[PDB]
Amino acid sequence: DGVKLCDVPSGTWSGHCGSSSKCSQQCKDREHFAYGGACHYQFPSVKCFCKRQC
């Protein structure tokens, strides 16, 4: 229904997140974030945030 996922900042990804598909792939590939990730705006640019389950 609505699993609670927390968008956590990546230390691996830096710069800009233009593709959420690659962001999510990165999160699943790098760590145990099977829910992937999304491009979330933070200062100063859109960065990749991995979705962990909370």
Side-chain angles (χ1 to χ4, degrees):
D1 295 87
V3 66
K4 309 299 175 60
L5 309 176
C6 304
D7 300 91
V8 299
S10 50
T12 41
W13 192 295
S14 300
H16 177 88
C17 188
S19 51
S20 45
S21 50
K22 297 186 180 184
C23 172
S24 49
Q25 177 57 31
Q26 180 279 147
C27 299
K28 300 171 186 178
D29 178 278
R30 274 54 174 148
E31 295 176 76
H32 304 259
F33 304 113
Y35 302 100
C39 301
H40 182 94
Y41 190 92
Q42 181 179 30
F43 190 86
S45 298
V46 182
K47 187 178 181 179
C48 176
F49 286 66
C50 302
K51 297 182 177 298
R52 60 156 290 170
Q53 193 189 329
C54 296

